[PDB]
Amino acid sequence: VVLTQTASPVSTPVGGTVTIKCQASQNIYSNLAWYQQKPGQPPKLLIYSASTLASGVPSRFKGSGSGTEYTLTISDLECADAATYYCQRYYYLSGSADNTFGGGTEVVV
Amino acid sequence: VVLTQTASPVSTPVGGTVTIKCQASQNIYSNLAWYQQKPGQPPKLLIYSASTLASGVPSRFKGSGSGTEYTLTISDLECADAATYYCQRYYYLSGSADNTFGGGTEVVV
Amino acid sequence: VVLTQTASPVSTPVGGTVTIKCQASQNIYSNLAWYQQKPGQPPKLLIYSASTLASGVPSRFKGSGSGTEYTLTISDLECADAATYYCQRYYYLSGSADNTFGGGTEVVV
Amino acid sequence: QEQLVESGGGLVQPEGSLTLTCTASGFSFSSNCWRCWVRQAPGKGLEWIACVCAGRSGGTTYYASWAKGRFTISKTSSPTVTLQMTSLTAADTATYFCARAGYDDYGDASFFNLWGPGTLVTV
Amino acid sequence: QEQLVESGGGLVQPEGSLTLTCTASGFSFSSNCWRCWVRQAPGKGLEWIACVCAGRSGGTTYYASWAKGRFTISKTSSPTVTLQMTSLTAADTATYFCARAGYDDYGDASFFNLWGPGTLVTV
Amino acid sequence: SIPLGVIHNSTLQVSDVDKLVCRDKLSSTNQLRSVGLNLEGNGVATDVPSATKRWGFRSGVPPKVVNYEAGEWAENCYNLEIKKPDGSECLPAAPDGIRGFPRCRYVHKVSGTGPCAGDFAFHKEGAFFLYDRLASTVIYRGTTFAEGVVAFLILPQAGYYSTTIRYQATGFGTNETEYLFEVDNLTYVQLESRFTPQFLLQLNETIYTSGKRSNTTGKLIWKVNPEIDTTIGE
Amino acid sequence: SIPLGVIHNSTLQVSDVDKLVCRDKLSSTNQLRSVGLNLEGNGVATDVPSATKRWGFRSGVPPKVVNYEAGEWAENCYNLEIKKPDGSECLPAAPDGIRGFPRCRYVHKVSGTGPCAGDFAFHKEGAFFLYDRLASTVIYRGTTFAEGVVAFLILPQAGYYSTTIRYQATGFGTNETEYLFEVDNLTYVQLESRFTPQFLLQLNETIYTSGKRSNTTGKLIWKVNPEIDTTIGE
Amino acid sequence: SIPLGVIHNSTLQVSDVDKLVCRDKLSSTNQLRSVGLNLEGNGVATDVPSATKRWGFRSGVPPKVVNYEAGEWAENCYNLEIKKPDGSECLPAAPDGIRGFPRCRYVHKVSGTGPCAGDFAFHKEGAFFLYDRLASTVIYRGTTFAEGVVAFLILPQAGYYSTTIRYQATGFGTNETEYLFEVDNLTYVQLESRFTPQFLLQLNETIYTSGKRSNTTGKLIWKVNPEIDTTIGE
Amino acid sequence: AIVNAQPKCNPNLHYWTTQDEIGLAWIPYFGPAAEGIYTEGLMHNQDGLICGLRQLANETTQALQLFLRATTELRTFSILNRKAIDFLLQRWGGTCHILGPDCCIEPH
Amino acid sequence: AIVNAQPKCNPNLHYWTTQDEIGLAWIPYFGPAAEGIYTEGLMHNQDGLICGLRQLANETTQALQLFLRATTELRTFSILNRKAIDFLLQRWGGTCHILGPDCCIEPH
Ligand SMILES: *[C@@H]1O[C@H](CO)[C@@H](O[C@@H]2O[C@H](CO)[C@@H](O[C@@H]3O[C@H](CO[C@H]4O[C@H](CO)[C@@H](O)[C@H](O)[C@@H]4O)[C@@H](O)[C@H](O[C@H]4O[C@H](CO)[C@@H](O)[C@H](O)[C@@H]4O)[C@@H]3O)[C@H](O)[C@H]2NC(C)=O)[C@H](O)[C@H]1NC(C)=O
Ligand SMILES: *[C@@H]1O[C@H](CO)[C@@H](O[C@@H]2O[C@H](CO)[C@@H](O[C@@H]3O[C@H](CO[C@H]4O[C@H](CO)[C@@H](O)[C@H](O)[C@@H]4O)[C@@H](O)[C@H](O[C@H]4O[C@H](CO)[C@@H](O)[C@H](O)[C@@H]4O)[C@@H]3O)[C@H](O)[C@H]2NC(C)=O)[C@H](O)[C@H]1NC(C)=O
Ligand SMILES: *[C@@H]1O[C@H](CO)[C@@H](O[C@@H]2O[C@H](CO)[C@@H](O[C@@H]3O[C@H](CO[C@H]4O[C@H](CO)[C@@H](O)[C@H](O)[C@@H]4O)[C@@H](O)[C@H](O[C@H]4O[C@H](CO)[C@@H](O)[C@H](O)[C@@H]4O)[C@@H]3O)[C@H](O)[C@H]2NC(C)=O)[C@H](O)[C@H]1NC(C)=O
Ligand SMILES: *[C@@H]1O[C@H](CO)[C@@H](O[C@@H]2O[C@H](CO)[C@@H](O)[C@H](O)[C@H]2NC(C)=O)[C@H](O)[C@H]1NC(C)=O
Ligand SMILES: *[C@@H]1O[C@H](CO)[C@@H](O[C@@H]2O[C@H](CO)[C@@H](O)[C@H](O)[C@H]2NC(C)=O)[C@H](O)[C@H]1NC(C)=O
Ligand SMILES: *[C@@H]1O[C@H](CO)[C@@H](O[C@@H]2O[C@H](CO)[C@@H](O)[C@H](O)[C@H]2NC(C)=O)[C@H](O)[C@H]1NC(C)=O
Ligand SMILES: *[C@@H]1O[C@H](CO)[C@@H](O)[C@H](O)[C@H]1NC(C)=O
Ligand SMILES: *[C@@H]1O[C@H](CO)[C@@H](O)[C@H](O)[C@H]1NC(C)=O
Ligand SMILES: *[C@@H]1O[C@H](CO)[C@@H](O)[C@H](O)[C@H]1NC(C)=O
């Protein structure tokens, strides 16, 4: 499976919403996870199951989409929200443990 | 509801067919309208209900789409058709009167 | 019918996979053919019926899609894979011969 | 072994006339009968001209919408097929290809699998 | 609270070998038992390597197609898990992370909710 | 009304509604039986060029379906997949519960293009299309069927090897239709209205053995001579 | 043939087809009745680990549904949500007109993953999944049901509390299946085949009162000791 | 139980279940019949403002449909298309097999908006929406119907031109609903509950002949005076 | 008997029905469209049949609605069959005395 | 009687039917697939039954098509039940004379 992100240095003024799209090559039945990685630090999980908010994550982030197209939207933008963003497809450990990451989309404040 | 337009200074030689896509954040049941705003003049309604042509508007413009994706197509572009374009979602005034405009797309001859 | 391609001189380092997207203004029931044209030489057939692989073509090229959205994926991009790519909608010659070509997408190694 | 070389073409003054010939060899002409012409402007996209069912009796001659009353094709019994154009204009200056239509499981379609080297027409 | 510190890594000549150690503390190891390794080349995307069910009897070890034979994860009864690499080619220089898999209503899945700081490997 | 046949002393007679027949006895619903009989048992042409001329297209008439409990082994069954020139599909998809004829010797898989007027494909002679224990009035896409009729009866008180033959047609539904028997993805044989399936299989075997398959990327269409009937021309 | 029960003198007999009895009397179709009886009335195991082993996946058999007009109050009812490892769904969506069992005391909601062979989940013992007045032969996704059978009778001439218990299963459909009772989104209890639903509710109450709930971001799985049966370990 | 009408000596009587009437005779199922009768035969208001107030919206009741074999010519029929304020659709799509009433004289096509509570539109008086040989208990979107009731009978032993009137409604389903009769895409007439369809057609013709149509891009709404009844005001 | 309690009655029943009973008209391919399979009739004469029949229709609706609520049929097509079966069972549904008042058998 | 007017008649009927009548074969889980639930037979012996049957099937189609056109069912399954009910009603429908020609109650 190949995943195509927005793939652009998105720039947005402070306070505006920023949207990132993670297209897939087939149906994945809403098995996407959204991660944020600041430079140097290890990535932090933001979204799993394409809709559920991870624990300790501000409600500003939102996820949606289904089938082959999924979106992550940041409604309110701050200075801290400047890092790389990834989308991965995951399997359940009962069967295979395949996990395919996206490309990576940086955000400029 | 968030309306995302093409968001690009589209350039097209005179005589071509330009297309502007206005994606939404959810299903809106084909409740869009298109406005052409020249610099300084007030906007003018072009297409309402996403397919019907407003009175006194040339049949050169054509709107289409459904669900969450809608497009406005201008054929054989002339020098006059050089203005900003907006997509706008509306309600029926029996209930609420909420309405939201698009970002705005500029076309260069 | 208007065929809208990627419309961008996409550049990809050798070894990666490139993707070309060919949009349509209406449902075409998967009647697209993909052509490549090196500078000077006549075009060559790559994929017909939007999924079938024409004779004398390496399995690197793949085609997919349905309805109004169709994609061509070139896997393991090579130096020789540098040409202008077209998507064409054809008809069955039983009662018609209309055919519309795409805009053309350039690929850079 | 299997070619669609073309003859004719070159420099012609505007409001002139020209005739082009397409020659085929190396395959069953009766079976693969559909021959079509394609036009490519310098640095532009491809564009269809006309098609003919040359190789058997009957058939139909399909013409493009923009080219009606012009660019008339001729049904010749021999595999060679001729296309004559009149009222030439500077816009017509382009490369002309002769192509053979392909086939599918449901019949033969308009996608072309075999092309020709192509000739240059200058107005 | 919960830490996934890793030990090892540094400068090693090509066609060599090195062992990384992942130490876990601050959470129920028997309950959350899946541990995986992820590699990130400098300035590139992430890449899964292998996973192991460390913390309970049985389980399964899942490997990646690209990393077969060259890599080997070890099932240690202690929460620490070791990954041994052989035949270190010049392309292996990257940052390595030890991660813990997450769970959903339908059971444990491959998405990782806890990460380690990451160790450097240069060849 | 619907006629009802009665079997007495190995003789079949139509039950008379007004006359009350005392000798007729019906002990349970197991005696009542609906049986579907093929048209090929009446001595009708079975080859594709003749069979396909008994079907037409129409619009404005909804389709109806009935059941039957017993059938007959069919020597010839058909399977159609037709498309409009623009690329769309003519025949509607199979509804849930519809399945192909369970006992067919030869299956004439036909795929092609045609004008496809109307909305549904009906039988010109008024017969039924027999699917698996279901007689319909319209043809469904890509589903094996057999032409046949249904009869109701009162019963007296008391391996499977299928072969698929593949065709191709242009201008389906019109009076000027051309059929081509397919022996390969690149080689075809001109089809007439006098070839039995055994002859078609023999022609296929001869084509494969004699090395007359097309070697280029084009199409090669053979044509059997009428007199000798064994030396294929072109 | 389908047996028919006759009730006379408060005694039930199976109707005899060949011997025609004149004592029995039928006056109207109101006397005919169909009744669905639960399997738990026969004294079979009802807990999830033993109940889920009676259902097996298969392909190549269409499903069938038959209605009934009266049922029995069910103490245990089930609700399944199974997905393949890749993320696809196994059980089909409930068709129109299908609803959950009306009278259920404890509803065992099981969600998990499994190999999901075949296409439909049938009963290994040949019983029915009752649903709401429509006994089927397959399991539908998200719809409450109850194992049971159907009987046909000729009648003689003459509050509600629902509790949902949530489980989580891994390896569903195989012999090596691991079940976990859920008390919270982060805390689980290992499940044995000897815990009545009331025992599970008491375990939930003890977990909540004693402050054994997970406080970190990970999962916490408790294991109850077999001997003392009140001091949960790990 | 469902009453059954018996016709004897050109008189109608209700069949008595307990008393077996020997003179009643039923030779074949052809004598049994079901007939649908419109409500307008009982002398009830038929104009849209009074008709639309007999239908309500509700959720939690599944719709049911029953067939009838004969009907009565209807003078008034209705065709509804209602949208929620956001733009969604209220009335469910027409299932396959449902078609409009066959014989209508005036069809009042009403399109408008409303709060649209509930899920289905039921009849407040308990009647049925007749449709074509399939009386239902709910309204389907864009399908011609007519309110009526179904009766069952034992039979004794023995041009069509339509007109469409176009309305527009605001606040449909509430007690404060405003109706407008549409004569053009831009010109409307305020509607009262005393205008016969022929009067509306005459108003249309008078407005066109008098040149009262809107010429601007805005809307024009006329209002017929109550006394003179021929001088439309504004 | 049945007495009409409706506010008003329309004494004439201008009806349409579907049953008919030539050439190739029975074949669906050559048959009439979906709108031309109906007939017409007018029962202008009646001995109060129409006015009582309307009241019978009004009377039956409560039982019909309750029966529809009870069943789980999406579409019901078998009411008349049940009525016929009930009629037959009531006439003959067990032991039948020849001279009994509950039997239709008469001696002669 | 029935006389066959068809161009040809096939004297043999090679039929298949689904009714059968073992261990766990009745259970759908262990039962045969959807393709192996049929049986086979051959009525080679005949006394004009097959030729009469083909003509009867030809004759029935007009009435069957008209009946299908009249109804509104998407799928009809209740023809045989209607035939049985009609048969019973014709046999017993009301007043029954013991010695009348309309009744089958033979005296002895
Ligand atoms: C029960 O059994 C009877 C008798 O066998 C069948 O009756 C057949 O009915 C079909 C049509 O329903 C008849 O087919 C018609 O053929 C006409 C020409 O006759 C041909 O056949 C005779 C047979 O002797 C030959 O002599 C003659 O030379 C012809 O070859 C056609 O004119 C008819 O219509 C055709 O023309 C019109 C106008 O051009 C077109 O619009 C039509 O589409 C079509 O092309 C028609 O085709 C058939 O002849 C009848 N049989 C006999 C023996 O006469 C019943 O069909 C059968 N019941 C069922 C359910 O099958
Ligand atoms: C109507 O009521 C009758 C009661 O007689 C039911 O009959 C039961 O049928 C099921 C299967 O249909 C029988 O279950 C079988 O059990 C075998 C082992 O016996 C167990 O139970 C006995 C009970 O005394 C114990 O003594 C014994 O120790 C076992 O615990 C299994 O071998 C059978 O198959 C199993 O193994 C095979 C091979 O590995 C697997 O493929 C199977 O999936 C399964 O695991 C089977 O499970 C049951 O014993 C019968 N009861 C009695 C009392 O005999 C009818 O089923 C019931 N009808 C309906 C519709 O409910
Ligand atoms: C079979 O035939 C009988 C009698 O012919 C019909 O009975 C009618 O029943 C409806 C309600 O079901 C009655 O309509 C009600 O009228 C009330 C006002 O009464 C007016 O009419 C009577 C007639 O006698 C006058 O005396 C009186 O002065 C009034 O002029 C309204 O207030 C009612 O509306 C209220 O109730 C309904 C339903 O509960 C609510 O939805 C409303 O919002 C409101 O709260 C109601 O409209 C009608 O009057 C009865 N007719 C007669 C002649 O008595 C049966 O309906 C009919 N069966 C079928 C199936 O059609
Ligand atoms: C036509 O005949 C050829 C050769 O007899 C068939 O090709 C073989 O088919 C069999 C089974 O059908 C395969 O097992 C072989 O592998 C095939 N190739 C050979 C023998 O070289 C072909 O299938 C036939 N086609 C039709 C339509 O009957
Ligand atoms: C497990 O126990 C907890 C604690 O008693 C339950 O949560 C309470 O449920 C009652 C309903 O019986 C509510 O009135 C309380 O407000 C709830 N309190 C809290 C803190 O949640 C919980 O519902 C039980 N779960 C199960 C499955 O029985
Ligand atoms: C109102 O009346 C006008 C005038 O008769 C109608 O307009 C004409 O309608 C007829 C058919 O009814 C058409 O053939 C004409 O072309 C129409 N235009 C004219 C005569 O200029 C109009 O349709 C009526 N509107 C309604 C709702 O009945
Ligand atoms: C087919 O029908 C058309 C109808 O006009 C006719 O022109 C043509 O000649 C027919 N073809 C044959 C082969 O008869
Ligand atoms: C489950 O079945 C498999 C099939 O081979 C077997 O290997 C395994 O041991 C079984 N497990 C148990 C617990 O019986
Ligand atoms: C409609 O109902 C509402 C309910 O609150 C009431 O306030 C209003 O007065 C009613 N309107 C009329 C015209 O009865």
Transcribe H178-196 into DSSP letters. EEEEESSSSEEEE--TT--
Alpha carbon distance F2, B65 (integer Å): 52
Our answer on whether the CB atom of H178 is closer than 6 Å to any ligand 9 atom is: no
| Tally of CA atoms within 13 A in the half-sphere of G160 that contains its CB | 6
Nearest ligand to residue F165 Cα: 4
Q: Is the CA virtual torsion E42, E48, E53, E58 positive or negative? A: negative
Alpha carbon distance F51, F225 (integer Å): 23
Contact criterion met (CB below 8 Å) for A46 and A35? yes
**Residue whose C-alpha is closest to residue D52's, from D17, D10, D22:** D22
**Which one of H29, H67, H133 has the shortest CB-CB distance to J89?**
H29
In the numeric block, which tokens belong to residue J106?
């033979």
Task: For chain C, list residues whose CB is within 8 angstroms of any CB belonging to chain B.
Answer: 2, 4, 25
In the numeric block, which tokens belong to residue A24?
């897939």
Could you identify the atom of ligand 1 that is nearest to the CA of residue F126?
A: 60
Q: Reduced to 3 states, what is the DSSP secondary structure of residue F61?
A: coil
What is the rounded radius of gyration, in angstroms, for the C-alpha atoms of chain J?
A: 21
State chain F's maximal CA–CA distance in angstroms.
76
Taking 3-state DSSP, the helix, strand and coil percentages for chain B, each rounded to the nearest 5, stand at 0, 40, 60
Alpha carbon distance F51, F77 (integer Å): 10
Kindly report the backbone phi and psi dihedral angles of residue E8, in degrees, each rounded to the nearest multiple of 5, phi listed first. 105, -175
Q: Do J56 and F151 touch (CB under 8 A)?
A: yes
Q: CA F92 from chain center: how many Å?
A: 17
Our answer on whether the CB atom of F177 is closer than 6 Å to any ligand 7 atom is: no
b/e per residue G59-82 (b: at least 16 CB within 10 A): eebebeeeebeebeebebbbbbbb
Contact criterion met (CB below 8 Å) for A92 and B21? no
The one-letter amino acid at H53: K
Helix (H) or strand (E) holding A42: none
Q: Do C49 and D104 touch (CB under 8 A)?
A: yes
Q: Reduced to 3 states, what is the DSSP secondary structure of residue F21?
A: coil
Alpha carbon distance G73, G44 (integer Å): 16
Region of F25 please: left (phi>0), alpha (psi -120 to 50) or beta.
Answer: beta
**Residue whose C-alpha is closest to residue J68's, from A7, D90, F150:** F150
Q: Reduced to 3 states, what is the DSSP secondary structure of residue J70?
A: helix
What is the rounded radius of gyration, in angstroms, for the C-alpha atoms of chain C?
A: 13
Mutate to test the interface with G, among E4, E28, E108 (most CBs of G within 10 A): E28
**Residue whose C-alpha is closest to residue J58's, from D6, E27, F41, I95:** F41
Checking DSSP bridges between strand E17-22 and strand E34-40, what pairing results, if any? unpaired
Question: Which residue in chain F is spatially nearest to J39 when comparing CA positions?
Answer: F70
Structure determined by: cryo-EM
Angle among Cα E19, E21, E24 to the nearest 5 degrees reads 170
Alpha carbon distance C35, G160 (integer Å): 69
After which residues does chain J become discontinuous at a C–N distance over 2.5 Å?
A: 21
Give, to the nearest 10 degrees, the angle between helix I79-91 and helix J79-91.
30
> What residues of B are in contact with residue H217 (Cβ under 8 Å)?
55-56
CA distance B31 to chain C (A): 20
b/e per residue H22-38 (b: at least 16 CB within 10 A): eebbbebbebbbbbbbb
Question: Which residue in chain H is spatially nearest to B56 when comparing CA positions?
Answer: H217
Question: Which residue in chain G is spatially nearest to I102 when comparing CA positions?
Answer: G27
DSSP I74: S
As a residue count, chain D comes to: 123
Q: Do I61 and H126 touch (CB under 8 A)?
A: yes
Question: Which residue in chain J is spatially nearest to G122 when comparing CA positions?
Answer: J29
Kindly report the backbone phi and psi dihedral angles of residue B38, in degrees, each rounded to the nearest multiple of 5, phi listed first. -80, 155
Alpha carbon distance C23, C30 (integer Å): 12
Checking DSSP bridges between strand B105-108 and strand B10-11, what pairing results, if any? parallel
Q: Dihedral through CA H151, CA H152, CA H156, CA H158, nearest 10? A: 100
In the numeric block, which tokens belong to residue E96?
């390595």
For the purposes of burial, counting CB atoms within 10 Å of the CB of G163, is it exposed (0-12), middle (13-18) or buried (19 or more)? exposed
Q: Reduced to 3 states, what is the DSSP secondary structure of residue G72?
A: coil
Alpha carbon distance F45, F28 (integer Å): 40
Our answer on whether the CB atom of H3 is closer than 6 Å to any ligand 3 atom is: no
The one-letter amino acid at G85: P
DSSP E62-97: EE-SSSSSSEEE---SSS-EEEEEES--GGG-EEEE
Alpha carbon distance H210, H208 (integer Å): 6
Nearest ligand to residue H176 Cα: 9
Which residue has the least CA distance to atom 2 on ligand 8? Answer: G175
Nearest ligand to residue I24 Cα: 1
Nearest ligand to residue G135 Cα: 2
In the numeric block, which tokens belong to residue H50?
């009074």
Our answer on whether the CB atom of I6 is closer than 6 Å to any ligand 3 atom is: yes
Ligand 6 neighbours by CB, cut-off 6 Å: H 166, 204-205, 208
DSSP G175: S
DSSP G80-141: EEEE-TTS-B-SPBPPTT----S-EEEEEEEEEE----SSEEEETTS-EE-TTTEEESS--B
For residue H205, how far is its CA from the centre of ligand 6 (angstroms)? 8
**Residue whose C-alpha is closest to residue A2's, from E63, F47, C74, F21:** C74
A 10 A CB-CB count for A1 gives 9
Kindly report the backbone phi and psi dihedral angles of residue C59, in degrees, each rounded to the nearest multiple of 5, phi listed first. -70, 0
Resolution (A): 3.0
Alpha carbon distance J29, G126 (integer Å): 7
Q: Reduced to 3 states, what is the DSSP secondary structure of residue J87?
A: helix
Q: Reduced to 3 states, what is the DSSP secondary structure of residue C32?
A: strand
In the numeric block, which tokens belong to residue D67?
């080219």
Contact of F85 with chain C, judged by CB distance below 8 Å, is answered with yes
A 10 A CB-CB count for C94 gives 24
Angle among Cα B35, B36, B39 to the nearest 5 degrees reads 130
Which residue has the least CA distance to atom 2 on ligand 2? Answer: G42
CA distance C91 to chain F (A): 6
Our answer on whether the CB atom of H176 is closer than 6 Å to any ligand 9 atom is: yes
**Residue whose C-alpha is closest to residue H74's, from H43, H122, H41, H42:** H41
Alpha carbon distance B85, G178 (integer Å): 59
Our answer on whether the CB atom of G151 is closer than 6 Å to any ligand 2 atom is: no
What are the beta bridge partners of residue D82?
Answer: D21, D74
Region of H42 please: left (phi>0), alpha (psi -120 to 50) or beta.
Answer: alpha
Our answer on whether the CB atom of F176 is closer than 6 Å to any ligand 7 atom is: yes
> What residues of A are in contact with residue G184 (Cβ under 8 Å)?
none
